[PDB]
Amino acid sequence: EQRLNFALLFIKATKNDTIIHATDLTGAETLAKSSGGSKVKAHRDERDPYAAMLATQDVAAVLKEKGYNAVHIKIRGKGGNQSKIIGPGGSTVIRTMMRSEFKLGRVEDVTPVATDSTRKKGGRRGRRL
Amino acid sequence: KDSFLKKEKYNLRIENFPVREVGATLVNKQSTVAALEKKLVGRVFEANQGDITTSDSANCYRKFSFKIDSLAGTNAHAIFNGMCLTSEKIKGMVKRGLTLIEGVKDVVTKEGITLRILTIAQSKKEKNSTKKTAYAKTSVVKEVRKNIFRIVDNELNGKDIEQIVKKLQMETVGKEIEKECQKIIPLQNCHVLKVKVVKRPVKE
Amino acid sequence: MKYNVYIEGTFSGIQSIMVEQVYPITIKCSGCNLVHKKDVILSIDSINYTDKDEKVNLKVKCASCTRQMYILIKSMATELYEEKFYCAKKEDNRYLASQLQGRGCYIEKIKDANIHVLSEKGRIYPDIVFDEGYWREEDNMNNTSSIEDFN
Amino acid sequence: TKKRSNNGRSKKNRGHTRCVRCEHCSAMVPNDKAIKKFVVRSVIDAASLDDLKIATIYEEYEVPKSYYKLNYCVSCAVHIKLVRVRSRWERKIRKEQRVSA
Amino acid sequence: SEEVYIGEVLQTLEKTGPGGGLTMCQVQLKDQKRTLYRAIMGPIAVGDLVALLDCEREHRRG
RNA sequence: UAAGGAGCGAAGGAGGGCUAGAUUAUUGAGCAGCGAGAGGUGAAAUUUGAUGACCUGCUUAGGAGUAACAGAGGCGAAAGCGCUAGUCAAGAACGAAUCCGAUGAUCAAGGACGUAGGCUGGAGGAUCGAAGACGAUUAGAGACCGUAGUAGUUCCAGCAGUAAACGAUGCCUACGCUGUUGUGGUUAUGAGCACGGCAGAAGAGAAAUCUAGUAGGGCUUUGGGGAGAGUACGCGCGCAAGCGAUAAAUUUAAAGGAAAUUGACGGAAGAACACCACAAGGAGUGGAGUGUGCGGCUUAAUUUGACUCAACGCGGGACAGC
Ligand SMILES: [Zn+2]
């Protein structure tokens, strides 16, 4: 019946935390925002698939209030000269949005890769543990 | 104090494609048309070719970018601002045992806009042949690259943007390159990789 | 996680509140979110160690996810009365007894604490019992000590 | 005594090579010596493809993949168990490993 | 609410999970084309009938 | 001349100097949206945020770098060299009926180059980070880990002269088994020439292994049981830091000397196995009173062995006398 009213959803997924943030198609207006660390207590759980899932539900609720129906997803890790694998939690944000009623448009990996780069932290020997 | 209540939606419109209207954007309500211009003009968005055309599901690998230019009532009108291939396509294309050929060139539209174009091609391993790799010799790569630049100059230099956009849609430059350069060596995956707007002329 | 243990209420005729640093507590695992099946006694005199040789007052393994949970008591006492009783630190209209430091768990509830009262007349009332959040005693000189709305 | 004929690295007929940085600890390691690993991972997990089939607006959809090449120093490769210690006759066997997902 | 699908087990594959508690199984639904892969935890015999809550959730590892 | 140098033809290469451009990325500022946390770890604290962080837009300013392709691939005397065009010299190899005719090999003294870190002067200053300062951990950490931070890290003109500068294998020139795979030219399409990788064999060697086979070919460097010692005195270079070159007295039966064999050990890796292991299930012990053993204290004496499994109703140890 109804047309598909679309929003953008950005997802950042590092080793330490996950950040979820919905915007208009222009990226220049913000509709809702949450993080894993907002909902959980212990610092070691901010990357947890569970904390990501709790934080996604709050964002899904506010979007349903503002009257949105469909979503495009752009997802990333940290990149630059650092790690460029998508962290834990990133792939549970997406599955949660699908259990909520939302129709999924398109998914894209938008991690910032460098053609060559500045020097990384850690010294010539690296972390010793 | 629910600021969200106090916002005006406007519809985004585009040209030289089969689909005219693509979505809508918010702003806080304002008294003066001069303010609304200064708030909306300068914004940008991107759309996949598969969303703004009726087409084979294969053509999803390309994105177009548009910049807000003008306001009329409910509608914001937006103009061409570049082209880009999707990350999955770029990363999936590169393979071990083959050579990449790459180029950068600058061109000028009749309208006066200056564009910068990035191009890619890959070598191909012939059939009925048993060597593991099909690398291209360094001097031969310079022959291909020299040819690519005259093809881009012939196709796009001194044209209108209405003409350029349809050439990009139909992928004519890739097709021409594969035809023309076959005499030097066999090639595959010939594509325009990115188009970037460098200078726009001071106009009213 | 850090939790402050306050003693709250309306205090009359009371010089100091002293608290046994022994807490029956309900704990929840921060890994699997399951509550521990029984309350655990957290005591300041209980000596345990983390797997990194840090002193803690409680070491408990989660029965479900096998994760280690640790709690340390920091007494907030300003002094020891008779070398035995931790005098809770007076803060405006309440008393700060201790700070509980949880690792790998949340403290969901403190059930009870053994409380002792020093009156303004220097009389000790050991192991005071609250009836419906009220406690009151009178001395042989008709001085009243009371705690009302105990929390 | 000399443990390996190739000194544990792939350099021959050269003086010097570019360095790269270890994924796990950021140590510098020469490119011709570093342990290499290839990954091709779907953006969407296998346990969600049955929901994707009812969530998507398109008639059919192909999930996007993500591609990586990772580099490791000797200590990290041994500790993460990408490689293991082997007997004096096994050391000589050379075979290509699988691409991970 | 009491939605349910009845499915017939055609094969068992692997003892699975910490301590080997589960069994990977292939199940065909009784009134649909669908055939799934699932983990089940009790003792199971081939040709058993099992009641599922979802016809879609799957154990792709097979 | 299957000795050298000069020259011709077509072609190949991250070899070098210069000129003009480039896609991203990391920081910093401006402005806009949003309204509570971000960062970091094995786990946390220093630390930063309502003077609006984080994240998402648009603008800008700088200084480094050239990902993936990318290899037992290429080039260079070695040290070393990876974006694109244009420009300037010289070199290596190959093809062939070009020219001159012993012009050659190796080398004390003498001369030129030499990663990085360092020093003298100018330019500049993104990222990283000796020193210095904190937060944790520990008996103590001055260290490892985290926050922050300076000299340096980049460029031009020079000084310096060391590296596990290593394939730990000097340079010319010989004689020498097979199969396979590369790179660049040429081809009667059969093959060759230059530069490589790999796998056997035969010989060799204390073995491990083989740049190590055969041998009165030529020339230079260089060692003579451990220590003291690459140290003292003198001398030469250098702005300094230092470097080059190099002794005695004294002490001692071997030397963490070399490779290979068997054990013991490890805080390794890989397969197996078991309700005196676990997982899924039963009954308890740990709390009370009493019975009994062990430590501690007392006493005239409270006699004594045994201490992870594998000490503690154990010593056939239920003692009024025995
Ligand atoms: Zn490492």
PDB file of C-alpha atoms in Angstrom, chain B residues 29-163:
ATOM      1  CA  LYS B  29      11.150  26.217   9.660  1.00  0.00           C
ATOM      2  CA  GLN B  30      12.380  29.733   8.737  1.00  0.00           C
ATOM      3  CA  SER B  31      10.779  33.117   8.005  1.00  0.00           C
ATOM      4  CA  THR B  32      12.864  34.323   5.075  1.00  0.00           C
ATOM      5  CA  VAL B  33      13.512  32.700   1.640  1.00  0.00           C
ATOM      6  CA  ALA B  34      17.157  33.895   1.821  1.00  0.00           C
ATOM      7  CA  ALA B  35      17.652  31.765   4.950  1.00  0.00           C
ATOM      8  CA  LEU B  36      16.094  28.649   3.368  1.00  0.00           C
ATOM      9  CA  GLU B  37      18.339  29.017   0.302  1.00  0.00           C
ATOM     10  CA  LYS B  38      21.451  29.326   2.514  1.00  0.00           C
ATOM     11  CA  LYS B  39      20.352  26.213   4.475  1.00  0.00           C
ATOM     12  CA  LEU B  40      19.346  23.841   1.620  1.00  0.00           C
ATOM     13  CA  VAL B  41      21.676  24.886  -1.208  1.00  0.00           C
ATOM     14  CA  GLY B  42      25.057  23.150  -0.951  1.00  0.00           C
ATOM     15  CA  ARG B  43      23.726  19.841   0.409  1.00  0.00           C
ATOM     16  CA  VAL B  44      24.591  16.542  -1.355  1.00  0.00           C
ATOM     17  CA  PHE B  45      23.199  13.016  -1.810  1.00  0.00           C
ATOM     18  CA  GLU B  46      23.982   9.789  -3.691  1.00  0.00           C
ATOM     19  CA  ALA B  47      21.848   7.211  -5.477  1.00  0.00           C
ATOM     20  CA  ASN B  48      22.517   3.806  -7.042  1.00  0.00           C
ATOM     21  CA  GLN B  49      21.949   3.426 -10.797  1.00  0.00           C
ATOM     22  CA  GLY B  50      19.578   0.541 -10.013  1.00  0.00           C
ATOM     23  CA  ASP B  51      17.274   2.842  -8.030  1.00  0.00           C
ATOM     24  CA  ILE B  52      17.008   5.715 -10.562  1.00  0.00           C
ATOM     25  CA  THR B  53      16.589   3.484 -13.667  1.00  0.00           C
ATOM     26  CA  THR B  54      14.574   0.463 -14.865  1.00  0.00           C
ATOM     27  CA  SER B  55      17.304  -2.002 -15.662  1.00  0.00           C
ATOM     28  CA  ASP B  56      19.087  -5.351 -15.291  1.00  0.00           C
ATOM     29  CA  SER B  57      19.819  -6.195 -11.631  1.00  0.00           C
ATOM     30  CA  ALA B  58      23.491  -6.593 -12.726  1.00  0.00           C
ATOM     31  CA  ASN B  59      23.973  -2.796 -13.076  1.00  0.00           C
ATOM     32  CA  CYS B  60      23.948  -2.207  -9.282  1.00  0.00           C
ATOM     33  CA  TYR B  61      27.712  -1.579  -9.170  1.00  0.00           C
ATOM     34  CA  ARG B  62      27.567   2.207  -9.861  1.00  0.00           C
ATOM     35  CA  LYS B  63      26.535   5.340  -7.905  1.00  0.00           C
ATOM     36  CA  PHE B  64      25.728   8.922  -8.978  1.00  0.00           C
ATOM     37  CA  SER B  65      26.072  12.057  -6.872  1.00  0.00           C
ATOM     38  CA  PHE B  66      24.001  15.268  -6.916  1.00  0.00           C
ATOM     39  CA  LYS B  67      24.317  18.764  -5.364  1.00  0.00           C
ATOM     40  CA  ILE B  68      21.252  20.919  -4.383  1.00  0.00           C
ATOM     41  CA  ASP B  69      21.049  23.986  -6.619  1.00  0.00           C
ATOM     42  CA  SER B  70      17.615  25.712  -6.613  1.00  0.00           C
ATOM     43  CA  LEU B  71      14.301  25.907  -4.671  1.00  0.00           C
ATOM     44  CA  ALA B  72      10.736  26.088  -6.042  1.00  0.00           C
ATOM     45  CA  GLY B  73       7.871  25.528  -3.614  1.00  0.00           C
ATOM     46  CA  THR B  74       7.883  21.907  -2.422  1.00  0.00           C
ATOM     47  CA  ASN B  75      10.806  20.976  -4.664  1.00  0.00           C
ATOM     48  CA  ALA B  76      14.582  21.227  -4.544  1.00  0.00           C
ATOM     49  CA  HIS B  77      16.391  20.794  -7.885  1.00  0.00           C
ATOM     50  CA  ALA B  78      19.822  19.123  -7.956  1.00  0.00           C
ATOM     51  CA  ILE B  79      22.680  18.843 -10.478  1.00  0.00           C
ATOM     52  CA  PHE B  80      25.309  16.213 -11.454  1.00  0.00           C
ATOM     53  CA  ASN B  81      28.331  16.150  -9.147  1.00  0.00           C
ATOM     54  CA  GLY B  82      30.187  12.887  -9.914  1.00  0.00           C
ATOM     55  CA  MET B  83      30.150   9.128 -10.464  1.00  0.00           C
ATOM     56  CA  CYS B  84      31.659   6.236  -8.461  1.00  0.00           C
ATOM     57  CA  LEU B  85      31.886   2.396  -8.584  1.00  0.00           C
ATOM     58  CA  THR B  86      30.868   0.425  -5.489  1.00  0.00           C
ATOM     59  CA  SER B  87      33.557  -0.956  -3.165  1.00  0.00           C
ATOM     60  CA  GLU B  88      32.541  -4.600  -3.741  1.00  0.00           C
ATOM     61  CA  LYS B  89      33.242  -4.175  -7.467  1.00  0.00           C
ATOM     62  CA  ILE B  90      36.685  -2.545  -7.134  1.00  0.00           C
ATOM     63  CA  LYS B  91      37.928  -5.006  -4.503  1.00  0.00           C
ATOM     64  CA  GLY B  92      36.437  -8.093  -6.171  1.00  0.00           C
ATOM     65  CA  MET B  93      38.002  -7.297  -9.553  1.00  0.00           C
ATOM     66  CA  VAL B  94      41.700  -7.502  -8.551  1.00  0.00           C
ATOM     67  CA  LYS B  95      43.254 -11.005  -8.880  1.00  0.00           C
ATOM     68  CA  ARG B  96      46.750 -12.567  -8.506  1.00  0.00           C
ATOM     69  CA  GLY B  97      48.786 -13.373 -11.637  1.00  0.00           C
ATOM     70  CA  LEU B  98      47.433 -10.412 -13.722  1.00  0.00           C
ATOM     71  CA  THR B  99      48.470  -6.763 -14.297  1.00  0.00           C
ATOM     72  CA  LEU B 100      46.408  -3.630 -13.474  1.00  0.00           C
ATOM     73  CA  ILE B 101      46.570  -0.613 -15.844  1.00  0.00           C
ATOM     74  CA  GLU B 102      45.523   2.765 -14.357  1.00  0.00           C
ATOM     75  CA  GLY B 103      45.207   6.384 -15.584  1.00  0.00           C
ATOM     76  CA  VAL B 104      44.164   9.946 -14.583  1.00  0.00           C
ATOM     77  CA  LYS B 105      43.023  12.673 -17.032  1.00  0.00           C
ATOM     78  CA  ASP B 106      41.421  16.165 -16.912  1.00  0.00           C
ATOM     79  CA  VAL B 107      38.722  17.428 -19.344  1.00  0.00           C
ATOM     80  CA  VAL B 108      36.603  20.582 -19.905  1.00  0.00           C
ATOM     81  CA  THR B 109      32.868  20.703 -20.668  1.00  0.00           C
ATOM     82  CA  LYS B 110      31.343  23.222 -23.123  1.00  0.00           C
ATOM     83  CA  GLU B 111      29.492  24.553 -20.053  1.00  0.00           C
ATOM     84  CA  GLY B 112      32.937  25.364 -18.538  1.00  0.00           C
ATOM     85  CA  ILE B 113      32.991  22.803 -15.671  1.00  0.00           C
ATOM     86  CA  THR B 114      36.321  20.944 -15.334  1.00  0.00           C
ATOM     87  CA  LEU B 115      36.248  17.202 -14.614  1.00  0.00           C
ATOM     88  CA  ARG B 116      38.879  14.682 -13.495  1.00  0.00           C
ATOM     89  CA  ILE B 117      38.461  11.067 -14.664  1.00  0.00           C
ATOM     90  CA  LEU B 118      40.030   7.840 -13.277  1.00  0.00           C
ATOM     91  CA  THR B 119      40.205   4.714 -15.476  1.00  0.00           C
ATOM     92  CA  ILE B 120      41.097   1.020 -14.930  1.00  0.00           C
ATOM     93  CA  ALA B 121      41.792  -2.099 -17.033  1.00  0.00           C
ATOM     94  CA  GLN B 122      43.191  -5.602 -16.376  1.00  0.00           C
ATOM     95  CA  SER B 123      45.237  -8.050 -18.506  1.00  0.00           C
ATOM     96  CA  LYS B 124      43.698 -11.386 -19.568  1.00  0.00           C
ATOM     97  CA  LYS B 125      45.087 -14.936 -19.859  1.00  0.00           C
ATOM     98  CA  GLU B 126      44.470 -16.449 -23.323  1.00  0.00           C
ATOM     99  CA  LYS B 127      42.976 -19.929 -23.931  1.00  0.00           C
ATOM    100  CA  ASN B 128      45.035 -22.938 -25.150  1.00  0.00           C
ATOM    101  CA  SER B 129      47.965 -21.682 -23.019  1.00  0.00           C
ATOM    102  CA  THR B 130      49.687 -23.303 -20.038  1.00  0.00           C
ATOM    103  CA  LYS B 131      51.802 -20.633 -18.280  1.00  0.00           C
ATOM    104  CA  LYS B 132      50.422 -19.805 -14.797  1.00  0.00           C
ATOM    105  CA  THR B 133      50.576 -15.979 -15.111  1.00  0.00           C
ATOM    106  CA  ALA B 134      49.602 -13.409 -17.743  1.00  0.00           C
ATOM    107  CA  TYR B 135      51.466 -10.250 -16.709  1.00  0.00           C
ATOM    108  CA  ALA B 136      51.927  -7.346 -19.141  1.00  0.00           C
ATOM    109  CA  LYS B 137      55.342  -5.889 -20.027  1.00  0.00           C
ATOM    110  CA  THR B 138      55.999  -2.362 -18.707  1.00  0.00           C
ATOM    111  CA  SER B 139      56.573  -0.767 -22.129  1.00  0.00           C
ATOM    112  CA  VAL B 140      53.336  -2.354 -23.470  1.00  0.00           C
ATOM    113  CA  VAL B 141      51.380  -0.881 -20.545  1.00  0.00           C
ATOM    114  CA  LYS B 142      52.495   2.579 -21.739  1.00  0.00           C
ATOM    115  CA  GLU B 143      51.045   1.834 -25.212  1.00  0.00           C
ATOM    116  CA  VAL B 144      47.621   0.991 -23.729  1.00  0.00           C
ATOM    117  CA  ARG B 145      47.643   4.026 -21.434  1.00  0.00           C
ATOM    118  CA  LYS B 146      48.583   6.318 -24.321  1.00  0.00           C
ATOM    119  CA  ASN B 147      45.561   4.983 -26.279  1.00  0.00           C
ATOM    120  CA  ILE B 148      43.151   5.352 -23.325  1.00  0.00           C
ATOM    121  CA  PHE B 149      43.876   9.094 -23.109  1.00  0.00           C
ATOM    122  CA  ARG B 150      42.997   9.753 -26.792  1.00  0.00           C
ATOM    123  CA  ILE B 151      39.760   7.747 -26.382  1.00  0.00           C
ATOM    124  CA  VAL B 152      38.698   9.792 -23.329  1.00  0.00           C
ATOM    125  CA  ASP B 153      39.628  13.045 -25.123  1.00  0.00           C
ATOM    126  CA  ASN B 154      37.551  12.060 -28.170  1.00  0.00           C
ATOM    127  CA  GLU B 155      34.518  10.932 -26.146  1.00  0.00           C
ATOM    128  CA  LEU B 156      34.060  13.580 -23.436  1.00  0.00           C
ATOM    129  CA  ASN B 157      36.061  16.779 -24.068  1.00  0.00           C
ATOM    130  CA  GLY B 158      34.052  19.900 -25.025  1.00  0.00           C
ATOM    131  CA  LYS B 159      30.616  18.200 -24.653  1.00  0.00           C
ATOM    132  CA  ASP B 160      27.517  19.135 -22.592  1.00  0.00           C
ATOM    133  CA  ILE B 161      26.711  17.555 -19.218  1.00  0.00           C
ATOM    134  CA  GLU B 162      23.461  16.202 -20.667  1.00  0.00           C
ATOM    135  CA  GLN B 163      25.604  14.243 -23.171  1.00  0.00           C
TER     136      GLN B 163
END
